[PDB]
């Protein structure tokens, strides 16, 4: 019984670690998406001010 529960706890650890590291990858790609969003934002706000001043 001790060995059985050892192995089951191990496989559960494996599953949890899979989920957690996939979430880490997702949050990293999301924060990169967010900085790219922000830089596109600054560029488009600047061209917005240009267009509005020239208009």
């Amino acid at each position: 019984r001790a060995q059985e529960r050892l192995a089951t706890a191990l496989q559960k650890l494996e599953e949890a670690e899979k989920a957690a590291d996939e979430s880490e990858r997702g949050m990293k790609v999301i924060e990169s998406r967010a900085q790219k969003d922000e830089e596109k934002m600054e560029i488009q706000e600047i061209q917005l001010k240009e267009a509005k001043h020239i208009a």
């Binding site: 990293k28 790609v29 990169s32 900085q35 790219k36």
Partner: protein, 371 residues
């Protein structure tokens, strides 16, 4: 009757039937041979394993690729690969099936000629045909206009097409691809003490690359953030243990596509050869080409490559033009999708190279109007 669609490529054979949504047989194009002694009598072991079987016995075999950069350099190995694909992965008799094969632009002529000679004499198909990979990518993409960047495993190329007319003088071909990215990643992993020298460890490194590498949006800022923080470090577990920790070489590897000087090449990045193919085209179609920039092939599968290439091409092109990069999720199989579509088209049934045409005209029939 049905046609087979075998997309060879340089490092992943994928085949199937014309009229399906996907290939039913995808395996590496490797041929392994045992390099050790062999002691157990009665084991009855073979002399060469091909395909996915050779991947389970990497620790015993020496792995060869029969296709270096598009070009086939080992015809015996390639004949073995084709035999395996026909009889063991697909289980079809190739004497009753037309076969559609693919190749990259600007290859030698003897490659294509010897390919058809094999397919008619050895495997004895009733008909066959060789297609350009970029055209099939464009079929599968649902377009008839666009510049397609097909980064495979041995060769990268751009092929601009407009309204179904291909502009051959603007085709670019570059010999930087996934195999060179794997070699560069092996070379820069040694900075942390990991060493992979065996042909069987090249596969471990390829899996590392596929699972962990990505394209940085800004290379200098990513280098700075990797130097400062430690939030980029990611671990990988080898077939044994000693989990390896990978830092900035997560994104220094695929950056070789945008800075080929990393591996000592003189040429320019993929963004710049794409832009150069554009500016090589006419002037009346450059807007459509900017708006229909199609990616395909396995080396275009890194996270962030679409955004990076859009940033670069947008910085290059004029400001009044809207750049767009089409990157489907099934990019790796686009050539096969397009090949299946094309071979199922009823108009195409007059374009095959029949066996009698070959018998009467020699293998030269392949560069002829029977393309």
């Amino acid at each position: 009757t049905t046609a087979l669609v075998c997309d060879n490529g340089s490092g992943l054979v994928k085949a199937g039937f014309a009229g399906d949504d996907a290939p039913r047989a995808v395996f590496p194009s490797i041929v392994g041979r045992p390099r050790h002694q062999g002691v157990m009598v009665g084991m009855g072991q073979k002399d060469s394993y091909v395909g996915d079987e050779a991947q389970s016995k990497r620790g015993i075999l020496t792995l060869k690729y029969p296709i270096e950069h598009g070009i086939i350099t080992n015809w015996d190995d390639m004949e073995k690969i084709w035999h395996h694909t026909f009889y063991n992965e697909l289980r079809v008799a190739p004497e009753e099936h037309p076969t559609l094969l693919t190749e990259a632009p600007l290859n030698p002529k003897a490659n294509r000629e010897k390919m058809t000679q094999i397919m008619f004499e050895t495997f004895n198909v009733p008909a066959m045909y060789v297609a350009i990979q970029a055209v099939l990518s464009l079929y599968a993409s649902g377009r008839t206009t666009g510049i397609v960047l097909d980064s495979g495993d041995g060769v990268t190329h751009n092929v601009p097409i407009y309204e179904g007319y291909a502009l051959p003088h603007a085709i670019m071909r570059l010999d930087l691809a996934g195999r060179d990215l794997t070699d560069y990643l092996m070379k820069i992993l040694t900075e942390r003490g990991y060493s992979f020298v065996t042909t069987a460890e090249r596969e471990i490194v390829r899996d590392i690359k596929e699972k962990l590498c990505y394209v940085a949006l800004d290379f200098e800022n990513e280098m700075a953030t990797a130097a400062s923080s430690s939030s980029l470090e990611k671990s990988y577990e080898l077939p044994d243990g000693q989990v390896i920790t990978i830092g900035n070489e997560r994104f220094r590897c695929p950056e070789t596509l945008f800075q080929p000087s990393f591996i000592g090449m003189e040429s320019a990045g993929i963004h710049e050869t794409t832009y150069n193919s554009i500016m090589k085209c006419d002037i009346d179609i450059r807007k459509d080409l900017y708006a229909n920039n199609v990616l395909s092939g396995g080396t275009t599968m890194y996270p962030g490559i679409a955004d990076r290439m859009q940033k670069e091409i947008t910085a290059l092109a004029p400001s009044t033009m809207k750049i767009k990069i089409i990157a489907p999720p099934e990019r790796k199989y686009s050539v096969w999708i397009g090949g299946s579509i094309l071979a199922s088209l009823s108009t195409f049934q007059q374009m095959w190279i029949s066996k009698q045409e070959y018998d009467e005209a020699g293998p030269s029939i392949v560069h002829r109007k029977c393309f």
